Design a protein around this motif. Structure first.
Motif, PDB file in Angstrom:
ATOM      1  N   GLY A 252      -3.937  -2.512   7.920  1.00  0.00           N
ATOM      2  CA  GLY A 252      -3.593  -2.754   9.162  1.00  0.00           C
ATOM      3  C   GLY A 252      -3.909  -4.125   9.494  1.00  0.00           C
ATOM      4  O   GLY A 252      -4.857  -4.578   9.230  1.00  0.00           O
ATOM      5  N   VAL A 253      -2.670  -4.817  10.368  1.00  0.00           N
ATOM      6  CA  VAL A 253      -2.881  -6.317  10.608  1.00  0.00           C
ATOM      7  C   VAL A 253      -3.040  -6.166  12.068  1.00  0.00           C
ATOM      8  O   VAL A 253      -1.904  -6.036  12.541  1.00  0.00           O
ATOM      9  N   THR A 254      -3.727  -6.877  12.528  1.00  0.00           N
ATOM     10  CA  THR A 254      -3.894  -7.117  13.960  1.00  0.00           C
ATOM     11  C   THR A 254      -2.848  -7.951  14.663  1.00  0.00           C
ATOM     12  O   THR A 254      -2.753  -8.832  14.206  1.00  0.00           O
ATOM     13  N   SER A 255      -2.564  -7.390  15.843  1.00  0.00           N
ATOM     14  CA  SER A 255      -1.617  -8.183  16.608  1.00  0.00           C
ATOM     15  C   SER A 255      -2.064  -9.740  16.960  1.00  0.00           C
ATOM     16  O   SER A 255      -3.207  -9.854  17.040  1.00  0.00           O
TER      17      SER A 255
ATOM     18  N   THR B 243       0.679 -16.542  12.444  1.00  0.00           N
ATOM     19  CA  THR B 243       1.325 -15.372  13.040  1.00  0.00           C
ATOM     20  C   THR B 243       1.098 -14.185  12.644  1.00  0.00           C
ATOM     21  O   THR B 243       0.857 -13.938  11.286  1.00  0.00           O
ATOM     22  N   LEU B 244       1.386 -13.049  13.236  1.00  0.00           N
ATOM     23  CA  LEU B 244       1.504 -11.772  12.544  1.00  0.00           C
ATOM     24  C   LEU B 244       2.434 -11.714  11.360  1.00  0.00           C
ATOM     25  O   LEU B 244       2.068 -11.233  10.423  1.00  0.00           O
ATOM     26  N   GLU B 245       3.776 -12.208  11.457  1.00  0.00           N
ATOM     27  CA  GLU B 245       4.652 -12.125  10.516  1.00  0.00           C
ATOM     28  C   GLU B 245       3.920 -13.071   9.158  1.00  0.00           C
ATOM     29  O   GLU B 245       4.290 -12.291   8.240  1.00  0.00           O
ATOM     30  N   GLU B 246       3.506 -13.986   9.482  1.00  0.00           N
ATOM     31  CA  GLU B 246       2.949 -14.872   8.241  1.00  0.00           C
ATOM     32  C   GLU B 246       1.708 -14.209   7.682  1.00  0.00           C
ATOM     33  O   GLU B 246       1.505 -13.966   6.475  1.00  0.00           O
ATOM     34  N   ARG B 247       0.838 -13.606   8.298  1.00  0.00           N
ATOM     35  CA  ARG B 247      -0.211 -12.678   7.882  1.00  0.00           C
ATOM     36  C   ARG B 247       0.044 -11.626   7.120  1.00  0.00           C
ATOM     37  O   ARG B 247      -0.425 -11.222   6.240  1.00  0.00           O
ATOM     38  N   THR B 248       1.393 -10.955   7.878  1.00  0.00           N
ATOM     39  CA  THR B 248       1.724  -9.651   7.090  1.00  0.00           C
ATOM     40  C   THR B 248       2.324 -10.080   5.623  1.00  0.00           C
ATOM     41  O   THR B 248       2.315  -9.434   4.598  1.00  0.00           O
ATOM     42  N   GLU B 249       3.154 -11.072   5.521  1.00  0.00           N
ATOM     43  CA  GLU B 249       3.956 -11.351   4.608  1.00  0.00           C
ATOM     44  C   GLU B 249       2.870 -11.663   3.444  1.00  0.00           C
ATOM     45  O   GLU B 249       3.499 -11.561   2.420  1.00  0.00           O
ATOM     46  N   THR B 250       1.960 -12.206   3.640  1.00  0.00           N
ATOM     47  CA  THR B 250       1.151 -12.841   2.610  1.00  0.00           C
ATOM     48  C   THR B 250       0.635 -11.501   1.944  1.00  0.00           C
ATOM     49  O   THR B 250       0.448 -11.530   0.651  1.00  0.00           O
ATOM     50  N   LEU B 251       0.073 -10.498   2.696  1.00  0.00           N
ATOM     51  CA  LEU B 251      -0.736  -9.441   2.155  1.00  0.00           C
ATOM     52  C   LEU B 251       0.294  -8.432   1.407  1.00  0.00           C
ATOM     53  O   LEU B 251      -0.325  -7.795   0.355  1.00  0.00           O
ATOM     54  N   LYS B 252       1.502  -8.679   1.637  1.00  0.00           N
ATOM     55  CA  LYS B 252       2.509  -8.020   0.816  1.00  0.00           C
ATOM     56  C   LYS B 252       2.509  -8.446  -0.702  1.00  0.00           C
ATOM     57  O   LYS B 252       3.084  -7.522  -1.370  1.00  0.00           O
ATOM     58  N   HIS B 253       1.875  -9.538  -1.066  1.00  0.00           N
ATOM     59  CA  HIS B 253       1.840 -10.207  -2.336  1.00  0.00           C
ATOM     60  C   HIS B 253       0.428  -9.776  -3.089  1.00  0.00           C
ATOM     61  O   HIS B 253       0.233  -9.902  -4.352  1.00  0.00           O
ATOM     62  N   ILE B 254      -0.449  -8.802  -2.593  1.00  0.00           N
ATOM     63  CA  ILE B 254      -1.733  -8.647  -3.044  1.00  0.00           C
ATOM     64  C   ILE B 254      -1.869  -7.335  -3.673  1.00  0.00           C
ATOM     65  O   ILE B 254      -0.881  -6.225  -3.071  1.00  0.00           O
ATOM     66  N   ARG B 255      -2.133  -7.200  -4.918  1.00  0.00           N
ATOM     67  CA  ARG B 255      -1.949  -6.069  -5.695  1.00  0.00           C
ATOM     68  C   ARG B 255      -2.338  -4.728  -5.118  1.00  0.00           C
ATOM     69  O   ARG B 255      -2.021  -3.498  -5.504  1.00  0.00           O
ATOM     70  N   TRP B 256      -3.659  -4.833  -4.703  1.00  0.00           N
ATOM     71  CA  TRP B 256      -4.106  -3.754  -4.086  1.00  0.00           C
ATOM     72  C   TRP B 256      -3.446  -3.114  -2.862  1.00  0.00           C
ATOM     73  O   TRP B 256      -3.864  -1.902  -2.447  1.00  0.00           O
ATOM     74  N   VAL B 257      -2.584  -3.514  -2.209  1.00  0.00           N
ATOM     75  CA  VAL B 257      -1.947  -3.266  -0.728  1.00  0.00           C
ATOM     76  C   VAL B 257      -0.865  -2.077  -1.188  1.00  0.00           C
ATOM     77  O   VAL B 257       0.010  -2.480  -1.697  1.00  0.00           O
ATOM     78  N   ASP B 258      -1.050  -0.993  -0.888  1.00  0.00           N
ATOM     79  CA  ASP B 258       0.072  -0.077  -0.938  1.00  0.00           C
ATOM     80  C   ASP B 258       0.988   0.077   0.152  1.00  0.00           C
ATOM     81  O   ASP B 258       2.166   0.302  -0.068  1.00  0.00           O
ATOM     82  N   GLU B 259       0.384   0.019   1.340  1.00  0.00           N
ATOM     83  CA  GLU B 259       1.207   0.168   2.663  1.00  0.00           C
ATOM     84  C   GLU B 259       0.772  -0.696   3.691  1.00  0.00           C
ATOM     85  O   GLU B 259      -0.585  -1.209   3.776  1.00  0.00           O
TER      86      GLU B 259
END
Lengths: 134, 134
Positions: free
Chosen positions: A38-41, A55-71
């Motif tokens: 979960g990524v805080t607003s 921003t939320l969009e930037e912090r979220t986009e970066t996490l998408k590249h992390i191998r441990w993150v499923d959702e």
């Protein structure tokens, strides 16, 4: 063994090795997991915690590249509720008066640890030391 | 379809979204790939290219957390050779007079792109703008 749904939330500003190791630890709490992050607003983070660079969009986009993150849940709620855990079928919440007492009472609290000295801002300090005060 | 071995190398200092998108692009050049990432040594990078903030061990440890990375060669050779590609059974080299003419001649060059304005140092500039010159 049966799949276990883990939830970890945070700001994840300027993602660094420390975040990545914490996500890894949450992902590996059991043999087979689904790690929901979960990524805080932006507004709630600044109101309740402090300043955020990305921003939320930037912090979220970066996490998408992390191998441990499923959702990813973005934005996530600022306060976890029992109904939130029911809604996403979350088995455990992983993270580092006690507003989390109900989580521990329910058997759904799993501790993870922070790594000191690996933050993005720590690297900037290292850069600056090439420049002598005198 | 058959698995394709892709090699991308670089410094990967202060890993940021731009690196991650380039790794993603290399990983997705074909349906089924093995992405090998080469991380340049500290001394060769500083001698031939320029300054590096993080050590080889730090730059390598961070890349291990990126979902697109299947294998890491650390340190990697500064100059790719045909025998290197033979030794690791590399099918294509992905990256952004022409020292790479032999790669293109061999059919093993695959272009990837850089993202502007997402670097770690770009975020520091954003932080600083909260402080008015006057």
């Amino acid at each position: 063994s049966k799949n276990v749904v883990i939830y970890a939330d945070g700001v994840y500003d300027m993602l660094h090795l420390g975040h990545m190791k914490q996500l890894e630890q949450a992902k590996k709490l059991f043999e087979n997991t689904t790690l929901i992050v979960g990524v805080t607003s932006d507004n709630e983070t600044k109101l309740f915690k402090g300043q955020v660079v990305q921003t939320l969009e930037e912090r979220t986009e970066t996490l998408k590249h992390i191998r441990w993150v499923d959702e990813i849940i973005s934005p996530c709620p600022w306060v976890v509720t029992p109904e939130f855990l029911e809604k996403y079928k979350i088995d455990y919440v992983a993270h580092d008066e006690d507003i989390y007492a109900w989580l521990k009472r329910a058997g759904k609290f799993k501790a993870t640890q922070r790594t000191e000295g690996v933050s993005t801002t720590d690297l900037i300090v290292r850069i600056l030391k090439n420049y002598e005060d005198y």
